[PDB]
């Protein structure tokens, strides 16, 4: 309004999955890698509630916060103004 393509949700889904794969987002209250084999074996026999709801409703948390995003994104980047809330 002040061009840049708008991508649809169908195409932003793959970007979201790559961002989950690159460890930018974590699932909410996720234990992650277990300490020993017995606890990992117990975890493998349990169906977590995040794996049964659709992916658009799964809760995620940031590994990098927006204040850290503003520090290392260059000021000549076109999305740099949106790193400040």
């Amino acid at each position: 309004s002040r061009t840049i393509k708008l991508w649809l949700k169908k195409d932003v889904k793959n970007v979201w999955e790559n961002l989950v794969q690159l460890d930018f987002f974590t699932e909410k209250s996720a234990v992650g890698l277990r300490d020993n084999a017995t606890a990992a074996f117990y975890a493998s026999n349990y169906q977590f509630q995040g794996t049964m709801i659709p992916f658009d409703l799964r809760s995620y948390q940031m590994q990098i916060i927006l204040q850290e995003l503003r520090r290392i994104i260059p000021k000549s980047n076109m999305y740099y103004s949106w790193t400040q809330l």
């Binding site: 889904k13 793959n14 999955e17 493998s44 026999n45 169906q47 794996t51 049964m52 659709p54 992916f55």
Partner: protein
């Protein structure tokens, strides 16, 4: 006490057909035996054709699955609307072993169990045709070194909508690792019951891109093009051709109840037709008259109850406006060619106009009322052949003595009852259940469950239990209850409790509490606590 146990087997002592005598007990036993034999010869004639239709649809489904399956990526087949009951048989490709591996969501708690079950099945099949190994994907790596031949694995996933899609996804990328081996071919079969848009949003996009390289949709169900159904209906019509009539209300009830079931509508149709045939051969004494052998013993009761007919009354009113047993026999030789008309119209739609997507039950409905033209106007191809394809529904006297009809509400009481509503109307009314004939108490005092259900219905969503007890207590006559509890003098403790001045406050309270726990067992009420029992809330509203 065996009633206080879990399961007990008993052997009854012993010191033959379930058909009863009709005509208010005046029907002979030979007519009962004949009606039994005629019901069985129609029932077996219908179900033999049902068996041949079921075997044919299974064989055709196997043939099209094999045709899609055999015509560095998976060969993916999506069977849409599949109830996971198909037996998928594989041909014996020369110099190569074809192995079927079936996977259930109960058999798939995680990826490790999926691989271990798959590799145990593979090793068991390979040893059963042609030292042990680790049940692991390295067996796929060394399959040619251990068995000499190469391998073709066909994975059939039973009930994919109920599986954990993360586990299935990780199993698909795990199976993708077998593409680097030269001697391995992998096919996947997904039995989908909802549609493909539900399963493309639960898998990851890389998995979709992996599955896109070789995939085939196949929408195989029971509602696909109405073919299998119409064959069952035509088999039933050919069973009853020349002897029995189908009412339009019966056919529309079949259409309405078969609309409400999608996955298993075929055996529902067989069930409704079966119960209709059972009802006709249990109710009607004229069921022995569907063949001309048994027309030699028509008695006075038969002539009495065939004279109470609307068609006969219209016919004799027409004759007295214009102008008995032999005349009743005279209405048996006629054809009623509506079934032949329906099968001729179906054949003309099928192999002349190349129209397959028609419902023969709804076609028979429109032929029964007479609105065939409005049903045939939709295809826009029978504009010039509508007059030859149309024939007037003939009216035959004494048709309703040989008729599958739905007017009493029997077929919607035994097969599709209003269960919750039946419980509610039994609890609220209660004089429609118990007969109105403790001789004084039954005419003034309600049963405790029916009396409680009234105050249940007229209260609010949360009910205090003590005020509900008080409202129960005001509906009971204390003097008649104390008189009835003193009727038996042979029980000493009852008499010594009745003369105690708070006896009615004991009696009404314990009848109230046994009704409350009865309501809790039926599921009408619940408690809004675990440690307290002071407030209930109701879960059942009448009329829903």
């Amino acid at each position: 006490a065996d009633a206080q146990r879990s399961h007990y087997t008993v052997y009854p002592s012993l010191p033959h057909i379930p058909f009863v005598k009709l005509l208010s007990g005046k029907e002979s036993e030979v007519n009962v035996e004949k009606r039994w034999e005629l019901y069985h010869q129609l029932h077996s004639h219908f179900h033999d054709q049902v068996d041949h239709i079921i075997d044919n649809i299974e064989a055709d489904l196997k043939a099209e699955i094999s045709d899609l399956l055999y015509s560095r990526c998976f060969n993916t087949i999506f069977l849409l609307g599949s109830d996971s009951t198909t037996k998928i048989e594989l041909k014996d490709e020369s110099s190569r072993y074809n192995v079927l591996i079936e996977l259930t969501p109960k058999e798939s708690p995680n990826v490790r169990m999926m691989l271990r079950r798959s590799m145990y099945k593979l090793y068991s099949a390979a040893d059963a045709e042609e030292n042990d190994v680790s049940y692991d994907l390295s067996l796929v790596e060394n399959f040619k070194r251990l068995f000499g031949k190469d391998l073709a694995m066909v994975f059939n996933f039973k009930d994919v909508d109920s599986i954990n899609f993360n586990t299935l996804d990780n199993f698909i990328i795990l199976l993708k690792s077998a593409f680097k081996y030269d001697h391995v071919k992998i096919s996947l079969i997904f039995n989908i019951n909802t549609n493909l848009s539900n399963i493309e949003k639960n898998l990851r996009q890389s998995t979709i891109r992996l599955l896109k390289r070789n995939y085939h949709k196949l929408d195989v169900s029971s509602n696909k093009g109405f073919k299998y159904g119409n064959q069952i209906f035509q088999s039933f019509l050919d069973t009853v051709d020349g002897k029995l009539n189908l009412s339009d209300r019966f056919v529309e009830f079949i259409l309405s109840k078969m609309a409400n079931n999608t996955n298993h509508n075929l055996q529902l149709l067989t069930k409704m037709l079966d119960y209709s045939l059972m009802s006709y051969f249990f109710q009607n004494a004229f069921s022995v008259f569907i063949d001309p052998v048994n027309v030699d013993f028509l008695n006075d009761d038969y002539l009495k109850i065939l004279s109470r007919c609307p068609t006969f009354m219209f016919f004799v009113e027409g004759l007295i406006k214009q102008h008995l047993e032999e005349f009743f026999v005279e209405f048996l030789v006629r054809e009623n060619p509506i079934n032949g008309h329906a099968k001729f119209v179906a054949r003309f739609l099928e192999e002349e106009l190349n129209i397959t997507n028609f419902n023969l039950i709804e076609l028979y409905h429109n032929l029964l009322i007479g609105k065939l033209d409005s049903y045939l106007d939709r295809w826009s191809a029978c504009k010039e052949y509508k007059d030859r394809l149309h024939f007037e529904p003939i009216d035959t006297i004494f048709q309703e003595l040989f008729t599958l009809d739905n007017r009493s509400g029997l077929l919607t009481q035994s097969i599709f009852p209003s269960y919750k509503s039946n419980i509610e109307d039994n609890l609220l009314s209660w004089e429609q259940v118990l007969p109105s004939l403790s001789g004084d108490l039954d005419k003034i005092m309600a049963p405790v469950l029916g009396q409680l259900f009234k105050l249940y219905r007229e209260a609010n969503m949360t009910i205090n239990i003590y005020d509900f007890y008080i409202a129960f207590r005001e509906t009971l006559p204390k003097e008649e209850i104390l008189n009835f509890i003193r009727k038996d003098p042979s029980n000493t403790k009852l008499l010594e409790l009745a003369e105690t001045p708070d006896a009615f406050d004991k009696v009404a309270l314990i009848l109230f509490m046994q009704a409350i726990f009865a309501f809790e067992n039926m599921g009408l009420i619940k408690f809004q606590s675990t440690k307290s029992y002071d407030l209930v809330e109701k879960c059942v509203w009448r009329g829903i």
